[PDB]
Amino acid sequence: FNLDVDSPAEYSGPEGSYFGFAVDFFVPSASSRMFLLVGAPKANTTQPGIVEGGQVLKCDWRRCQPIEFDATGNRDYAKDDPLEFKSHQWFGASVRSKQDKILACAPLYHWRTEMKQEREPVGTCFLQDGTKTVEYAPCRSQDIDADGQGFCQGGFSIDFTKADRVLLGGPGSFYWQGQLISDQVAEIVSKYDPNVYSIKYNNQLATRTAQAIFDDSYLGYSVAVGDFNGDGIDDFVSGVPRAARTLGMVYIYDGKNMSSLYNFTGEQMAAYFGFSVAATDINGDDYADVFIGAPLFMDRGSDGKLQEVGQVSVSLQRASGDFQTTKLNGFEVFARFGSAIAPLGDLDQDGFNDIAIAAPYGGEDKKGIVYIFNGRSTGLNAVPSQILEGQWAARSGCPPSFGYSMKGATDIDKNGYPDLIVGAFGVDRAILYRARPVITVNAGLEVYPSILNQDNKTCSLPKVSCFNVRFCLKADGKGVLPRKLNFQVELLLDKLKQKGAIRRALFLYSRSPSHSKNMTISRGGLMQCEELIAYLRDESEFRDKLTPITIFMEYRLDYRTAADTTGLQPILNQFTPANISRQAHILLD
Amino acid sequence: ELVKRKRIEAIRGQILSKLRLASPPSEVPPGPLPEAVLALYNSTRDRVAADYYAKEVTRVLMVETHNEIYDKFKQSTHSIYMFFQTSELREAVPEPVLLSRAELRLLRLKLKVEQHVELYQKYSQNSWRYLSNRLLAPSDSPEWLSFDVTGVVRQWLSRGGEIEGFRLSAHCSCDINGFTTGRRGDLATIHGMNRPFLLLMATPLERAQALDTNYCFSSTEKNCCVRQLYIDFRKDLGWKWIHEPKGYHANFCLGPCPYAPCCVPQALEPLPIVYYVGRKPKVEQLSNMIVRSCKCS
Amino acid sequence: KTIDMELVKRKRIEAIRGQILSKLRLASPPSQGEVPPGPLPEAVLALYNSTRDRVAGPEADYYAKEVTRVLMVETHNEIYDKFKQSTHSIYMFFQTSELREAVPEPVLLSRAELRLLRLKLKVEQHVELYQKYSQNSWRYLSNRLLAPSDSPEWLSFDVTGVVRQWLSRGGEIEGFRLSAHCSCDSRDNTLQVDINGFTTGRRGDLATIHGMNRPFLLLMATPLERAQSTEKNCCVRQLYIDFRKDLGWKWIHEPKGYHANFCLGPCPYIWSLDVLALYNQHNPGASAAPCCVPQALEPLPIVYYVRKPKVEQLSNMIVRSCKCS
Numbered sequence A: 001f002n003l004d005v006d007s008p009a010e011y012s013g014p015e016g017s018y019f020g021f022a023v024d025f026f027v028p029s030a031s032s033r034m035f036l037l038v039g040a041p042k043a044n045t046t047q048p049g050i051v052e053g054g055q056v057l058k059c060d061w062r063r064c065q066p067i068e069f070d071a072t073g074n075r076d077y078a079k080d081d082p083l084e085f086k087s088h089q090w091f092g093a094s095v096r097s098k099q100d101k102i103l104a105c106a107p108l109y110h111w112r113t114e115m116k117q118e119r120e121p122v123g124t125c126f127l128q129d130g131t132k133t134v135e136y137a138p139c140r141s142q143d144i145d146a147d148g149q150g151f152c153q154g155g156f157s158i159d160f161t162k163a164d165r166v167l168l169g170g171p172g173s174f175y176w177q178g179q180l181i182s183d184q185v186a187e188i189v190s191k192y193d194p195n196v197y198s199i200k201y202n203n204q205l206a207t208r209t210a211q212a213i214f215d216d217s218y219l220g221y222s223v224a225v226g227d228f229n230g231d232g233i234d235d236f237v238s239g240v241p242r243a244a245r246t247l248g249m250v251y252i253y254d255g256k257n258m259s260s261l262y263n264f265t266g267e268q269m270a271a272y273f274g275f276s277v278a279a280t281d282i283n284g285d286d287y288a289d290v291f292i293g294a295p296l297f298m299d300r301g302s303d304g305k306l307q308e309v310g311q312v313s314v315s316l317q318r319a320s321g322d323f324q325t326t327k328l329n330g331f332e333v334f335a336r337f338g339s340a341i342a343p344l345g346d347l348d349q350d351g352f353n354d355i356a357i358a359a360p361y362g363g364e365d366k367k368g369i370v371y372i373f374n375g376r377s378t379g380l381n382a383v384p385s386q387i388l389e390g391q392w393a394a395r396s397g398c399p400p401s402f403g404y405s406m407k408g409a410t411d412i413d414k415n416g417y418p419d420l421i422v423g424a425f426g427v428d429r430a431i432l433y434r435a436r437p438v439i440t441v442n443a444g445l446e447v448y449p450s451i452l453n454q455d456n457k458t459c460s461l462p463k464v465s466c467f468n469v470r471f472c473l474k475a476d477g478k479g480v481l482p483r484k485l486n487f488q489v490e491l492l493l494d495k496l497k498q499k500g501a502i503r504r505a506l507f508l509y510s511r512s513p514s515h516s517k518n519m520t521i522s523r524g525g526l527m528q529c530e531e532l533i534a535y536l537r538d539e540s541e542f543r544d545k546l547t548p549i550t551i552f553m554e555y556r557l558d559y560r561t562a563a564d565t566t567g568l569q570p571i572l573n574q575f576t577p578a579n580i581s582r583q584a585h586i587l588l589d
Numbered sequence B: 001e002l003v004k005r006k007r008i009e010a011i012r013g014q015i016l017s018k019l020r021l022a023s024p025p026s027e028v029p030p031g032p033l034p035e036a037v038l039a040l041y042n043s044t045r046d047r048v049a050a051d052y053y054a055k056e057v058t059r060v061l062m063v064e065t066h067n068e069i070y071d072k073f074k075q076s077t078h079s080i081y082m083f084f085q086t087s088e089l090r091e092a093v094p095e096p097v098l099l100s101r102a103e104l105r106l107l108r109l110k111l112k113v114e115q116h117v118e119l120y121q122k123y124s125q126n127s128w129r130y131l132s133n134r135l136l137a138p139s140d141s142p143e144w145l146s147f148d149v150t151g152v153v154r155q156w157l158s159r160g161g162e163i164e165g166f167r168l169s170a171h172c173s174c175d176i177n178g179f180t181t182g183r184r185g186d187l188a189t190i191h192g193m194n195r196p197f198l199l200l201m202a203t204p205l206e207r208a209q210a211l212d213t214n215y216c217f218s219s220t221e222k223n224c225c226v227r228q229l230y231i232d233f234r235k236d237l238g239w240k241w242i243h244e245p246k247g248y249h250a251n252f253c254l255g256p257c258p259y260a261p262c263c264v265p266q267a268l269e270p271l272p273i274v275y276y277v278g279r280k281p282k283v284e285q286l287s288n289m290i291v292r293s294c295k296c297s
Numbered sequence C: 001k002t003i004d005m006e007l008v009k010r011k012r013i014e015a016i017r018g019q020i021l022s023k024l025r026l027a028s029p030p031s032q033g034e035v036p037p038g039p040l041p042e043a044v045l046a047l048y049n050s051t052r053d054r055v056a057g058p059e060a061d062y063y064a065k066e067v068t069r070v071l072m073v074e075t076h077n078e079i080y081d082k083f084k085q086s087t088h089s090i091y092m093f094f095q096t097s098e099l100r101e102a103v104p105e106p107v108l109l110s111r112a113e114l115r116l117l118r119l120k121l122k123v124e125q126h127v128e129l130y131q132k133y134s135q136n137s138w139r140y141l142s143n144r145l146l147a148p149s150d151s152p153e154w155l156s157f158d159v160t161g162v163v164r165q166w167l168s169r170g171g172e173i174e175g176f177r178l179s180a181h182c183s184c185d186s187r188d189n190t191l192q193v194d195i196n197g198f199t200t201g202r203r204g205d206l207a208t209i210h211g212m213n214r215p216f217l218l219l220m221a222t223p224l225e226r227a228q229s230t231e232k233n234c235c236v237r238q239l240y241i242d243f244r245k246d247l248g249w250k251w252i253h254e255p256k257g258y259h260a261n262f263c264l265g266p267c268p269y270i271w272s273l274d275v276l277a278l279y280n281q282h283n284p285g286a287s288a289a290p291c292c293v294p295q296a297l298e299p300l301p302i303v304y305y306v307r308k309p310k311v312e313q314l315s316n317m318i319v320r321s322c323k324c325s
């Protein structure tokens, strides 16, 4: 709810380049600056003879700079015999970053066999750990042809573990059975050799080939990491959307010896159960939880007609090994809710992680919507607390696809709150939404006495029936915010009487039914309270002694004086921002 | 006198933070307060024998020789059996996660010679499984010991078994020893006051409601984190007189510690070296070289 | 609080340099023109390989310790003459002419842990260790529960107090005994542990190497060649704190005062003239910036009211000692 939609950062790349197809963060060595990593897989580069090689750009929080992963053209196997084809390789289709490491891949990279003249899409990745740039093509092997890893398209999806292992998905391996490959980063760079086209890694973990019934399964279509067998080693989660006769499945493998741990299965044919997956602990139990998107899920409408809305299943991990699974249906028809799932960390710093789910084709003009969901003790809140709307219309070709890729859980502005990058490759754009600080306010209101006598003269005046109004105010926040929060408080006596009626209350010295007061209070210290005297009008001035006198107290914030150096204005917690009211009565008999 | 006044204001901010409190609470008796909590306070100061917040200390006494403690045991003159009720344990500490430290304390009487003691746990209400061990010294005065059974108490609060207990026999040479008297009350306090009680230290529900290289190397900390540092002898020192090793990960602690608190290492590891002395090779081990963890104190 | 460098790492390196030399009680590196390049015996490589194996379990403790080991006596001598091997116990024997030769004076001995070799034992076992008294009697030492290791495991038992007593007597023959747990009050017994032994019957050419990895006693002693409060340095100063006097808090009944000390004093390093002399107190951690920090702390129990009196205990309050690290 606290994402700043008033002043978001708009980053742009070359038009038609699908700029924003993959997004991620960049946090290098020590306490340095932070960057946005954006993929543009159809982007023309300066590579000799390479048309639309693609690139990954480093943007500053505010110009963007291309990252030089590879400046060379197509290597030759022999004279007039090109070894590789980097044109239209879609480099930057998936970008994943861990500390000072940036991993980008080219899923549509084709490579000619070293036995004969083929053009097989084995896929390749480039890894940059500071200065050294290495190549990584675990599917570029001697296991050629569709039967092997020739059509693997390694690097279609990637992720990092907490133990410096890379997780790579290859949906085309073994006649499109798919394959997961995991290599230690110490081995990737050490065993790299620009003169060796098929490097064999000893600590490689891979899903070996199975029976022919499992062909055309697309294992490795999406990936995510998290511990599930309760050992400490990040395990491999991957969607298998065409498995189970187009029902869609998700396989879980152990991250130590590549063994199957748990299975999930879609519940509707061709719902693409497994298009996107994510792993993050959502209910504060230190057990990573599985989020599976099925953007093509069709549910039944109220009228009995089917409607494609997409579905995400939420599976809560338990120590007993089981899973508590629920299902979250999309809101808009054909929006493909569940196309992208980005763990956000604790977006609002409430003690429970939160998550974003995108419907890249929802909203007006099919521009795109991103829904923000908050965690709680019982799991994920099914109702979204914030709606991110796309602003960019569809020129021609692909729709804007706002939300198609996203990544969270990184506080890029050191504001105390993790922020969120949202890609929209159809309009070549990426947008940074900054989390606004959340102010929790506890307001109080005491009215003593409750019963106002018709003639109780006590407070000094040259004396009329008067009473004390004591209102207390306390505020706090959890992040990087200033101490002094300036509040504007308004009080209205006897509001129930609309403008034009007969009023019956007004402050003692202000001589005015309303009293304004500018209030600087400090968060965290103590509750600052203030008393003041208001009185009732004489009996003969109004015959209306039946209309209960409601004391109304309203409070607001300045925001401008509570903003940050970056102009990020805080925001109140959503269920408890309101003003409060109480009342006193005149009795008889 | 100015040096001492700065620490006091840090103690003020520490105690309130340890209680997770911003301000102290807001009477009776004009005489001495109840000796039920003075028995706890006299039992907490009596020491013969991460988590910086406070722990609420409560205790529970054992069951007399009545209440069915006798139809099962009673006569093994070389042992002592102790039993407790779970209906009162899960009331001082509701959630097993709140339990932090649970040490079982007894009371010694015999002062002459020495004995060897083995401790067991109650399983299947008939079988006993080994726990810990401790040798005893002839102290001329009554001494108070304690056995850390936190791991045992934690599992018992998760179970609905309303009857549990412990067993204290002597050494088994593979012959019974330890308790040479058959009254069972000569060596320890039976059926009297100051009888064995289980001292508990848990965290209130009001509260709940130092990582090492496994976190400091996978994340970029701005605070007191242990940074990586591989020290080579030939490269960073110019020492070719040390055969093994020829380089190691000593690391260091760098980082701030706010609420002068410094980033000091908490856990260190020794390093074995191999060097020659003229013609005599000596394999020696240096103490505390590899910095594992780092703390702020 | 000013930008900071990567030179902090070099401050550690130059503190390590002076540290290693001080723990070895050396002023300059020794001569290596008296050392022959090439020969690296596999006898000292087994020592170094056993010291890197860390089995889970004052002024003289900061200096270096010369690590030497001694293997045991085989079952081909004396170990079969009285008892041999049985399911009830396992016997290991050592000499003394080599124990008091690696550590001549019994005082030099610092830590002496006896290390063995486990085999896969799966579920559960319990082991008790004994010492040889006089010749006839055996006395308890320690005990240890066993975990289901599917792979060969290496253990270690701190028998320092035993070896020191063995170095004081001229007893030319010593040894240990390894039986198992004794379930008593009702009588049960047996041993099921598979430790690397002799098996008695392995012969041939490879039989000679089947005596390797046998139980050995790792020793860590101080070489014979070494032998031998007034708030100047980092010392802990006295400070008595009263609650009514120094805090003005009447809401805490007990206690009514305690001694909360503090650490005052500088901790510098690599000073002119040099020092390599006082290195055990100035910077024993060899850190880039040594601070006078407390090393040992003690908790404090408190008593306060809220209708429910709660007895609580605070962690880390009383400062005992102060170090530079």
Ligand SMILES: *[C@@H]1O[C@H](CO)[C@@H](O[C@@H]2O[C@H](CO)[C@@H](O[C@@H]3O[C@H](CO[C@H]4O[C@H](CO[C@H]5O[C@H](CO)[C@@H](O)[C@H](O)[C@@H]5O)[C@@H](O)[C@H](O[C@H]5O[C@H](CO)[C@@H](O)[C@H](O)[C@@H]5O)[C@@H]4O)[C@@H](O)[C@H](O[C@H]4O[C@H](CO)[C@@H](O)[C@H](O)[C@@H]4O)[C@@H]3O)[C@H](O)[C@H]2NC(C)=O)[C@H](O)[C@H]1NC(C)=O
Binding pocket: A207, A209, A210, A211, A212, A214, A251, A260, A261, A262, A263
């Ligand atoms: C979650 O769900 C998923 C999906 O269901 C599940 O993952 C699959 O789990 C099933 C469980 O059974 C796995 O099925 C097993 O697959 C084994 C395959 O590996 C070997 O077997 C190959 C068999 O060859 C087939 O084809 C030939 C004809 O070509 C035919 O004659 C055979 O009978 C067989 O059908 C074998 O060829 C292959 O060998 C390779 O390498 C050699 C060189 O060594 C080379 O010469 C070969 O050419 C080949 O390249 C490979 O080694 C299979 O062996 C195994 O067999 C068991 O079941 C049968 C039937 O019950 C028994 O008769 C047999 O004795 C075995 O017990 C079994 O069928 C499937 O592979 C998984 N898919 C994966 C991992 O992608 C997860 O397990 C689920 N999760 C959980 C927790 O359950």
Ligand SMILES: *[C@@H]1O[C@H](CO)[C@@H](O[C@@H]2O[C@H](CO)[C@@H](O[C@@H]3O[C@H](CO[C@H]4O[C@H](CO)[C@@H](O)[C@H](O)[C@@H]4O)[C@@H](O)[C@H](O[C@H]4O[C@H](CO)[C@@H](O)[C@H](O)[C@@H]4O[C@H]4O[C@H](CO)[C@@H](O)[C@H](O)[C@@H]4O)[C@@H]3O)[C@H](O)[C@H]2NC(C)=O)[C@H](O)[C@H]1NC(C)=O
Binding pocket: A202, C042, C045, C046, C049
């Ligand atoms: C005291 O300790 C020292 C070292 O601390 C030791 O010297 C070393 O001995 C070990 C024997 O275990 C040697 O390790 C072997 O290495 C070869 C090849 O290694 C090459 O590369 C190294 C660089 O690291 C070079 O220095 C070296 O000269 C070689 O060129 C391996 O082939 C050995 O076997 C492995 O493969 C087998 C399959 O054939 C496996 O079955 C076996 O498990 C071995 O490990 C493999 O599997 C492991 C999983 O279980 C996996 O984790 C491993 O990575 C590997 O894949 C063997 O490992 C080592 O080279 C020696 N060091 C030097 C500098 O020479 C002393 O011998 C020792 N003294 C004693 C015991 O008395």
Ligand SMILES: *[C@@H]1O[C@H](CO)[C@@H](O[C@@H]2O[C@H](CO)[C@@H](O[C@@H]3O[C@H](CO[C@H]4O[C@H](CO[C@H]5O[C@H](CO)[C@@H](O)[C@H](O)[C@@H]5O)[C@@H](O)[C@H](O)[C@@H]4O)[C@@H](O)[C@H](O[C@H]4O[C@H](CO)[C@@H](O)[C@H](O)[C@@H]4O)[C@@H]3O)[C@H](O)[C@H]2NC(C)=O)[C@H](O)[C@H]1NC(C)=O
Binding pocket: A228, A229, A230, A231, A254, A256, A257, A259, A318, A319, A320, A321, C122, C123, C148, C149, C150
């Ligand atoms: C590839 O790697 C995987 C894992 O990385 C290996 O799978 C392992 O298999 C071994 C069997 O060889 C299992 O060990 C057994 O443990 C039993 C005791 O339970 C312990 O493990 C629990 C695991 O956690 C549980 O919860 C999670 C949910 O979080 C579940 O998903 C999971 O399935 C478990 O149910 C711990 O939680 C628990 O606290 C225990 O520590 C033992 O009883 C068992 O047999 C022993 O005892 C036998 C006789 O009693 C004896 O004969 C045997 O030799 C053995 O000693 C065995 O030890 C591992 O638990 C299991 N891993 C995991 C993560 O569960 C797989 O073997 C490996 N493959 C290869 C080829 O290397």
Ligand SMILES: *[C@@H]1O[C@H](CO)[C@@H](O[C@@H]2O[C@H](CO)[C@@H](O[C@@H]3O[C@H](CO)[C@@H](O)[C@H](O[C@H]4O[C@H](CO)[C@@H](O)[C@H](O)[C@@H]4O)[C@@H]3O)[C@H](O)[C@H]2NC(C)=O)[C@H](O)[C@H]1NC(C)=O
Binding pocket: B038, B042
């Ligand atoms: C619970 O703890 C409290 C303290 O927290 C403890 O109070 C102790 O009371 C004894 C008195 O019995 C104190 O000891 C006395 O100290 C003065 C000198 O200051 C002596 O003169 C006293 O004389 C003793 O010796 C006599 C010899 O003829 C005895 O006959 C006579 O009974 C006296 O004991 C005595 O030494 C002691 O100082 C305090 N404790 C502290 C910390 O000050 C109380 O007794 C404890 N209660 C239980 C049930 O454990």
Ligand SMILES: *[C@@H]1O[C@H](CO)[C@@H](O[C@@H]2O[C@H](CO)[C@@H](O[C@@H]3O[C@H](CO[C@H]4O[C@H](CO)[C@@H](O)[C@H](O)[C@@H]4O)[C@@H](O)[C@H](O)[C@@H]3O)[C@H](O)[C@H]2NC(C)=O)[C@H](O)[C@H]1NC(C)=O
Binding pocket: A448, A449, A451, A452, A453, A456, A457, A458, A459, A466, A467, A468, A531
């Ligand atoms: C006629 O009008 C008179 C004035 O308008 C009324 O006098 C009022 O009488 C009520 C009792 O019903 C008083 O309320 C009490 O106030 C005390 C104040 O003590 C606190 O003071 C400060 C806050 O200012 C606080 O910090 C302290 O710690 C004390 O807690 C409360 O403690 C009591 O609970 C109680 O509410 C009014 O204070 C008093 N008004 C004035 C101006 O003195 C009179 O009651 C009316 N007659 C009727 C209605 O018949």
Ligand SMILES: *[C@@H]1O[C@H](CO)[C@@H](O[C@@H]2O[C@H](CO)[C@@H](O[C@@H]3O[C@H](CO)[C@@H](O)[C@H](O)[C@@H]3O)[C@H](O)[C@H]2NC(C)=O)[C@H](O)[C@H]1NC(C)=O
Binding pocket: A014, A015, A016, A017, A042, A043, A044, A051, A052
């Ligand atoms: C990246 O650069 C390439 C060129 O290096 C761009 O490809 C060019 O695309 C245009 C259409 O967008 C092609 O024009 C066509 O020409 C043919 C004649 O061959 C004509 O018949 C068609 O009707 C059309 O007009 C152009 O040929 C093509 N260039 C090459 C060398 O093939 C590409 O658009 C650039 N992409 C981005 C994102 O900048």
Ligand SMILES: *[C@@H]1O[C@H](CO)[C@@H](O[C@@H]2O[C@H](CO)[C@@H](O)[C@H](O)[C@H]2NC(C)=O)[C@H](O)[C@H]1NC(C)=O
Binding pocket: A554, A578, A579, A580
């Ligand atoms: C004080 O703030 C509350 C907010 O809770 C206002 O209540 C709103 O009232 C309008 C119509 O009366 C409703 O349409 C809104 O839905 C209410 N808000 C909520 C959050 O339910 C109230 O109007 C404010 N006071 C005044 C005088 O305007």
Ligand SMILES: *[C@@H]1O[C@H](CO)[C@@H](O)[C@H](O)[C@H]1NC(C)=O
Binding pocket: A488, A516, A517, A518
């Ligand atoms: C308080 O500040 C407001 C501006 O928000 C101003 O209009 C008003 O006059 C101020 N009132 C007082 C009493 O300072």
Ligand SMILES: [Ca+2]
Binding pocket: A226, A227, A228, A229, A230, A231, A232, A233, A234, A235, A254, A255
């Ligand atoms: Ca795992």
Ligand SMILES: [Ca+2]
Binding pocket: A280, A281, A282, A283, A284, A285, A286, A287, A288, A289, A316, A317
């Ligand atoms: Ca969870």
Ligand SMILES: [Ca+2]
Binding pocket: A346, A347, A348, A349, A350, A351, A352, A353, A354, A374, A375
């Ligand atoms: Ca949250």
Ligand SMILES: [Ca+2]
Binding pocket: A411, A412, A413, A414, A415, A416, A417, A418, A419, A434, A435
């Ligand atoms: Ca932020």
